[PDB]
Write an enzyme that holds these catalytic residues in place. Structure first.
Site, PDB file in Angstrom:
ATOM      1  N   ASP A  46      -7.755   7.114  -6.442  1.00  0.00           N
ATOM      2  CA  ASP A  46      -7.072   6.417  -5.349  1.00  0.00           C
ATOM      3  C   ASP A  46      -5.625   6.873  -5.266  1.00  0.00           C
ATOM      4  O   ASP A  46      -4.659   6.189  -5.648  1.00  0.00           O
ATOM      5  CB  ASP A  46      -7.232   4.901  -5.486  1.00  0.00           C
ATOM      6  CG  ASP A  46      -6.828   4.156  -4.213  1.00  0.00           C
ATOM      7  OD1 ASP A  46      -6.626   4.808  -3.170  1.00  0.00           O
ATOM      8  OD2 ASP A  46      -6.776   2.902  -4.267  1.00  0.00           O
ATOM      9  N   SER A  49      -0.486  -2.206  -2.223  1.00  0.00           N
ATOM     10  CA  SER A  49      -1.192  -0.967  -2.485  1.00  0.00           C
ATOM     11  C   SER A  49      -0.384   0.283  -2.144  1.00  0.00           C
ATOM     12  O   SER A  49       0.359   0.312  -1.166  1.00  0.00           O
ATOM     13  CB  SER A  49      -2.451  -0.879  -1.606  1.00  0.00           C
ATOM     14  OG  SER A  49      -3.417  -1.814  -2.076  1.00  0.00           O
ATOM     15  N   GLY A  50      -0.536   1.292  -3.004  1.00  0.00           N
ATOM     16  CA  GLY A  50       0.142   2.567  -2.792  1.00  0.00           C
ATOM     17  C   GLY A  50       1.503   2.620  -3.462  1.00  0.00           C
ATOM     18  O   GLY A  50       2.083   3.712  -3.609  1.00  0.00           O
ATOM     19  N   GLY A  78      -1.023  -5.290   0.579  1.00  0.00           N
ATOM     20  CA  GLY A  78       0.239  -4.813   1.158  1.00  0.00           C
ATOM     21  C   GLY A  78       1.108  -4.143   0.082  1.00  0.00           C
ATOM     22  O   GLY A  78       2.066  -3.449   0.444  1.00  0.00           O
ATOM     23  N   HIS A 100      -6.620   4.863  -0.338  1.00  0.00           N
ATOM     24  CA  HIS A 100      -7.238   3.846   0.517  1.00  0.00           C
ATOM     25  C   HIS A 100      -6.295   3.376   1.611  1.00  0.00           C
ATOM     26  O   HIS A 100      -6.732   2.869   2.662  1.00  0.00           O
ATOM     27  CB  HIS A 100      -7.780   2.680  -0.300  1.00  0.00           C
ATOM     28  CG  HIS A 100      -6.816   1.596  -0.671  1.00  0.00           C
ATOM     29  ND1 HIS A 100      -6.369   1.460  -1.977  1.00  0.00           N
ATOM     30  CD2 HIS A 100      -6.212   0.618   0.054  1.00  0.00           C
ATOM     31  CE1 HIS A 100      -5.535   0.422  -2.028  1.00  0.00           C
ATOM     32  NE2 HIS A 100      -5.413  -0.105  -0.813  1.00  0.00           N
TER      33      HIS A 100
HETATM   34 XE   LIG Z   1      -3.607  -4.796  -4.106  1.00  0.00          XE
END
Ligand SMILES: [Xe]
Ligand SMILES: [Cl-]
Ligand code: NA
Length: 240
Positions: free
Chosen positions: A93, A188-189, A186, A45
């Site tokens: 994801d 995420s990943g 922020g 995402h």
């Molecule tokens: Xe998140």
């Protein structure tokens, strides 16, 4: 990261900052894990938008010179083929980014260790989330890399009705949910680092939090379970 503490500069050397070109500057948007000198693992995402991305390794403070950074462009983006942007709850994801150059390893830049395929952590296993994401729900990004202690919440509890219900899949890892600390936008990943047999390994890729807020009791941060994707990861790196 909400309720985090500042990470020491050399604790998590596989953490990267994934940034996009914004005007004449670069803006942090997500974390990632360096897994090869020229490959980064992040969330699918994070690379949905058609932006220009770069990776920063050896990054500690987004806004000040650390004297350890290496800045490298993203040459190729491989998203998991089953990812669907309007269905984060379906899973998948995850994405791999091939870097334009191979970075140099040192105490601030190292490859992240991944778990063996199929590994599932026992409930309440010790883990840390790291990142520069919001420090409060609807807040602002952190300047310095943060870490927060988020114990895992197993599938049975995490998919129960007062937690995430059907939203969580067995291809995900849940961690935290205490109402005080959590991942936030922020983050995420980035990685979820869990201590197993004396060594930290990256068991999760940060994927989502509740729409009601980041640190919500019984809504642990949800991560893509890295150990479900080992063959996929190996297959992409070998054909690219
Ligand atoms: Xe998140
Ligand atoms: Cl690391
Ligand atoms: Na910096």
């Amino acid at each position: 990261v909400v309720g985090g503490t500042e990470a020491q500069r050399n604790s998590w050397p596989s953490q990267i900052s994934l940034q996009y070109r914004s005007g004449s500057s670069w803006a942090h948007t997500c974390g990632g894990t360096l897994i090869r000198q020229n490959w980064v693992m992040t969330a699918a995402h994070c690379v949905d938008r058609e932006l220009t991305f770069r990776v920063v390794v050896g990054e500690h403070n987004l806004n000040q010179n650390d004297g350890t950074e290496q800045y490298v462009g993203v040459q190729k983006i491989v998203v998991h083929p089953y990812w669907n942007t309007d269905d984060v709850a379906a899973g998948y994801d995850i994405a791999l980014l091939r870097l334009a150059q191979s970075v140099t390893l040192n105490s601030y830049v190292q490859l992240g260790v991944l778990p063996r395929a199929g590994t599932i952590l026992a409930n309440n296993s010790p883990c840390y989330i790291t990142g520069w994401g919001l420090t409060r729900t609807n807040g602002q990004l952190a300047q310095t890399l943060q870490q927060a202690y988020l114990p895992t919440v197993d599938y049975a509890i995490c998919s129960s009705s007062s937690y995430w219900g059907s939203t969580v899949k067995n291809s995900m890892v849940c961690a935290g949910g205490d109402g005080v600390r959590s991942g936030c936008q922020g983050d995420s990943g980035g990685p979820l680092h869990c201590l197993v047999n004396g060594q930290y390994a990256v068991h999760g890729v940060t994927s989502f939090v509740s729409r009601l807020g980041c640190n919500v009791t019984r809504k642990p941060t949800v991560f893509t379970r890295v150990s479900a994707y080992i063959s996929w990861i190996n297959n992409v790196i070998a054909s690219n």
